[PDB]
Amino acid sequence: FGMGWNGNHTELENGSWGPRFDGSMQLWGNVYNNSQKLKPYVAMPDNIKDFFDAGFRYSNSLSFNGATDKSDYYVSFSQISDDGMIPTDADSYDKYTFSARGSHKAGALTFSSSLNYAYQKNNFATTGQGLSMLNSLYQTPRDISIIGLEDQNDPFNTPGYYYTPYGVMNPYYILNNYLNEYESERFYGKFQLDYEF
Amino acid sequence: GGITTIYGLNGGTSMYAITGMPVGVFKAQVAERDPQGRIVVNSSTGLPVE
Amino acid sequence: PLYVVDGVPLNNSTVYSTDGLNSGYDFGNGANAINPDDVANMTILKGAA
Amino acid sequence: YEQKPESNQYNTLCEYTFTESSQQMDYSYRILFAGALEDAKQVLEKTT
Amino acid sequence: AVGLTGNHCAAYPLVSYLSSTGDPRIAYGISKTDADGKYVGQLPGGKT
């Protein structure tokens, strides 16, 4: 069954309590400039599945190492940059670390030290019951083409003429126009003095 | 009391810590039943009765 | 659990939204910062005696 | 007033289908007693 | 009006009464129907 409520056909619902799929041509969505979209009343089973992309992530890690009979030294660097499967750059995580660890022994005394810096930039596709992406995405009729909503030069996808006005918004608008970023800087380390006597 | 909320919606499903029970007990609205197991529904709408 | 690195306690604070119903998000926890390529050995002490 | 046709927040108030566990006034119960009534008790202790 | 969307509509007893008596206060807090421009109340619990 497709777009509707009470089992009856509708042109504007966020749900799929309409009639059993006909193949007939029915209307849907809002009306813009005395025009409306018209499509065959069929199911689009892949519509939510097709909304996603492939997340991509690239990582680079290096390390430098060496030692003597009285000393050792390690220095490393890591880099991570994730842009996940939800469209646009709202699923983002950049990780950067740097570390330097050493120990030196001189007699009974041993002094070692570790110092690490960590960076991250998170961006998140916010969840919730309001004007969020996934809540807006699940509230789609089974017959409506989701990936057909991304083109904003199509007036019918602009926020004022989106096909349904029921507590949800065009998911590509929410991802392209909302913000929830986090940037963090972090330093940690230790100093240890060992002395045998 | 022997009960305390850990997280939960107002008038909705809520997860508790109750005295003689495991951590994280859930309570949620179920429909009414007659003493003999059958589901009570509303005479006019057909829908279950809380 | 208490994350202990060499061997100093590590901050494991979590940054996530305080209203999960309307603006849910999660930004990481303090252990996610360690670089796994640097780990030689991890040992988990399970008991508390 | 009544429940608008196209939304669904107050169906159970209008149809009298809430119950005790619907907490339909716990927010107000807390405000009146642990907000106001406590502040009042403190006022009457602090001023003569 | 901010936390939720508009959920309340006029109820039938209030509308029928303000209409019977010719009361102009029927315009305060109540809005004519966006379809025919009259005042309509909904019978309590009768949305569905």
């Binding site: 966020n14 749900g15 309001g130 | 997280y7 919606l9 909705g12 809520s14 | - | - | -």
Partner: peptide, 10 residues
């Protein structure tokens, strides 16, 4: 317990 949620349009 605390938080509350809306319903939907339909």
């Amino acid at each position: 317990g605390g938080g509350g949620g809306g319903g939907g349009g339909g």
